[PDB]
């Protein structure tokens, strides 16, 4: 499960809402540890 | 991240060249199909 907002909400062009800024609770190289990761996805890569 | 400002990806086709290209395609379709009829080009019908 990924948590997201818009990358640049303050955009009035064709790209508004196209790039999303998402966060994860991601696996680290050690089995017992997690890391918080922020990354960008395109609208076409995700669904609600 | 984006080092600047967000823009949409796009492709540029010379308009006149494309029109000549279709004219050639239509002329050839007419050789076996529609010698005196109408050829209409349209956008794709749907799917992903």
């Amino acid at each position: 499960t990924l948590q997201c907002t818009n990358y640049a909400p303050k955009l009035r062009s064709m790209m508004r809402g196209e790039i999303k800024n998402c966060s994860f609770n991601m696996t680290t190289e050690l089995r017992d540890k997690k890391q918080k990761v922020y990354s960008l996805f395109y609208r076409l890569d995700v669904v609600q | 991240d984006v080092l600047g400002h967000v823009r949409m990806a796009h492709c540029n086709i010379s308009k006149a060249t494309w029109n000549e290209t279709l004219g050639k395609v239509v002329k050839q379709l007419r050789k076996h199909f529609g010698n005196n009829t109408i050829i209409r080009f349209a956008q794709s019908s749907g799917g992903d």
Partner: antibody, heavy 128, light 99 residues
Framework: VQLQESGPGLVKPSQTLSLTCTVS??????????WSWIRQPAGKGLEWIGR???????NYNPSLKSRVTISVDTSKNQFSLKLSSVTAADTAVYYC???????????????????????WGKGTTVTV | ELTQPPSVSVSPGQTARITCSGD??????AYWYQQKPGQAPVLVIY???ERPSGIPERFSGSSSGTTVTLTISGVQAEDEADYYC?????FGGGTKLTV
């Protein structure tokens, strides 16, 4: 570019107004710019009236939408504002201004920020 | 859709903090103007804290969520003005700054 407003400095109550603005040293034709009017009652803050594109397309402040027509004379480089019947509540300064916009990308994709009014005139003061 | 304090006042040299808030702000850029009495408003800030060339370094600002702040560091007597902010639906309103 300088902006110079003109119009009646006095209108009767229940009487209409026609205001213009000359774009001096500039033109109304093309560019990323939009033309617009804003009202300022002498003791109040600003109220946007409306905007016009050089294409003729317009956007009016809902508060005055039924009362306002905006038009640009691109042969004269004069920006016009027409108001319906005017009352005491309209005893205000009417300003002419040019709103900006820029371009980063494709113009047809609207890739270009937005600016509010960058270039202002002096304002027509109208007694009602 | 925005609200503003009716006034702010500072001693010369202090930072003025003029704010605007409302529902459009998380999605739209704020723009700010400094209006001297008798003059058309001067744009000081655009696109959330960017300033036009010719505008003093005193003018800066920031935002979070629904609130935007226009900050003037080192406010001088020359800065007293009617300050306005806008976002759209297409305008806002303003605050009186005395020094």
């Amino acid at each position: 570019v300088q902006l110079q407003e003109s119009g009646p400095g006095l209108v009767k109550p229940s009487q209409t107004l026609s205001l213009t603005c000359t774009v001096s040293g500039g033109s109304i034709s093309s560019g990323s710019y939009y033309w617009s009017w804003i009202r300022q009652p002498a003791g109040k803050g600003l109220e946007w009236i409306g905007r016009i594109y050089t294409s003729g397309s317009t956007n009016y402040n809902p508060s005055l939408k039924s009362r306002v027509t905006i038009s640009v004379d691109t042969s004269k480089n004069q920006f016009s504002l027409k108001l319906s019947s005017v009352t005491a509540a309209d005893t205000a300064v009417y300003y002419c201004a040019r709103e900006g916009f820029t371009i980063f990308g494709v113009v047809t994709f609207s890739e270009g920020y937005y600016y509010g009014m960058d270039v202002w005139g002096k304002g027509t003061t109208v007694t009602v | 859709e925005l609200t503003q304090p009716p006034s702010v006042s500072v001693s010369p040299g202090q930072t003025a903090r003029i704010t605007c808030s409302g529902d459009a702000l998380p999605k739209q850029y704020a723009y700010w103007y400094q209006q001297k009495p008798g003059q058309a408003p001067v744009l000081v800030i655009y696109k959330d804290s960017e300033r036009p060339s010719g505008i003093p370094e005193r003018f800066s600002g920031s935002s979070s969520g629904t609130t935007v702040t226009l900050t003037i560091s080192g406010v001088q007597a020359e800065d007293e003005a009617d300050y306005y902010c806008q976002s759209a639906d297409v305008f806002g309103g303003g605050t009186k700054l005395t020094v």
